[PDB]
Amino acid sequence: GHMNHRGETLLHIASIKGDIPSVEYLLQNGSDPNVKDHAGWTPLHEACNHGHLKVVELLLQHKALVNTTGYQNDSPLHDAAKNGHVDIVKLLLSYGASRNAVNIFGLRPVDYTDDESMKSLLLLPDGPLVLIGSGLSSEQQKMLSELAVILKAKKYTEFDSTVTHVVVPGDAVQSTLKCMLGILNGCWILKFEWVKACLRRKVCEQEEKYEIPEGPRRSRLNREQLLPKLFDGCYFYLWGTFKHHPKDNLIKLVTAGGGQILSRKPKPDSDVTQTINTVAYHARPDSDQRFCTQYIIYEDLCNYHPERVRQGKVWKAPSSWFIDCVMSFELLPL
């Protein structure tokens, strides 16, 4: 709705100055509290940093996403501990919400408190519906077009920044550019039966019964829970030439996944690779893949298993692995 130049909505500025009457006014009217500004701070973050309690209470009672990630993947617990609010972290732990959380640096909230009390208290066991077809037929595309123009929608050039719904003709998702941009963005993947349901009732239906229960569904829940993208703090380098998927198509995939395309082959013995100091949110909880997030990608055609997939912090992963990652919306080990 109305926003500041910094992305701060009405609830953001209301919780920053901690104006509680305005908080109640905007929360009893139906404003969504699970919104991130241009940085990624939610009203929970702002409230926790500035030191306010009643707004946190109303937000927790109004079904606000507490397991959210802020600018540098800072959970509200991070700021609440970093700014020395003990009753605030107590109220936060009253709801749980991943007490052992992690920022991009890797520093769990405890590494911030620098306080004995917190260190002892922490360690106890939608908008426009864009409908565009992905590899459909002619009459199928005309059907989606008329359903869009009757349901107050538009038709884009196969992708934009406001796409929320995509469709697959078959039962399983393909591996083309559009489905990858749909999965990485957290869109709704439908099996082409949803339009068949809407053409019989002339109204919108529920997307839960027409969504496939695979990696794309995990990406949908990831986007809904405001957690970061798949390839966050993961740096990718495209080695050699590509023929299956263009290097440009992979670059766009890494950019949409939130990862940075490294332009210069990452040498495992250099200082730049070892000074990265970033982790990956979707890496396995306690495996050997969080502290080492830097991948050299290549099409598995000639260069086979080099008997060493990880050399320090630089991984050598095939492009098929990069595609299976989007398949499962995970960072599979090597």
Partner: peptide, 23 residues
Amino acid sequence: IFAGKQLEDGRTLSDYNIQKEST
């Protein structure tokens, strides 16, 4: 020396964020 720093004695290695196989 690591990462362009001097790494003087008295501080732990986790301060400089030296992970596994860091040259």
